[PDB]
From TrEMBL:
<feature type="domain" description="NlpC/P60">
    <location>
        <begin position="8"/>
        <end position="135"/>
    </location>
</feature>
<comment type="similarity">
    <text>Belongs to the peptidase C40 family.</text>
</comment>
<protein>
    <recommendedName>
        <fullName>NlpC/P60 domain-containing protein</fullName>
    </recommendedName>
</protein>
Length: 135
């Protein structure tokens, strides 16, 4: 029972942290565990998040340090069938999840980085075959 409670408690913390960043601008390669930062290249002069950076920030609240890169996140935790998705699960885009990543919020909502950190409907186009549970 404590397992379930800890999972639920962790999930709530991570969602709260992610949601607190709504509106922060996209920055190519920006951000990480400690919050938004300048990125590189096109993002060198912009403080913000890319998808990977935002996930690292949000999940750090549950005492988890996620790998850098969506492609590396796709290779940790438990692979989940999308039909069995729960809030807190990670959704991936591109071949082997290397293009991007977002956090499922339940009811076909996800926290993603668009032009800014935002809550969006789930996008199925280009979605990787599995989701990932780390909590």
């Amino acid at each position: 029972g404590v397992r379930a409670m800890d999972y639920q408690q962790a999930t709530d913390v991570v969602i709260a942290r992610g949601l607190s960043q709504r509106g922060v601008p996209f920055s190519w390669a920006g951000g990480g565990i400690n919050g938004p930062t300048r990125g590189t290249g096109t993002g060198a002069n912009t403080v913000g998040f890319d998808a990977s950076g935002l996930m690292q920030y949000a999940y750090a609240g549950a005492g988890i340090k996620l790998p850098r890169s969506s492609g590396a996140m796709y290779r940790v935790g438990q692979k989940i069938l999308p039909q069995q998705a729960r809030k807190g699960d990670l959704i991936f885009y591109g071949p082997e999840g290397t293009q991007s990543v977002a956090m499922y919020l339940g009811n076909n909502q996800m926290l993603e980085v668009g032009d800014v950190v935002q809550v969006s409907p789930v996008r199925t186009a280009g979605m990787a075959p599995y989701m990932v549970r780390v909590l």
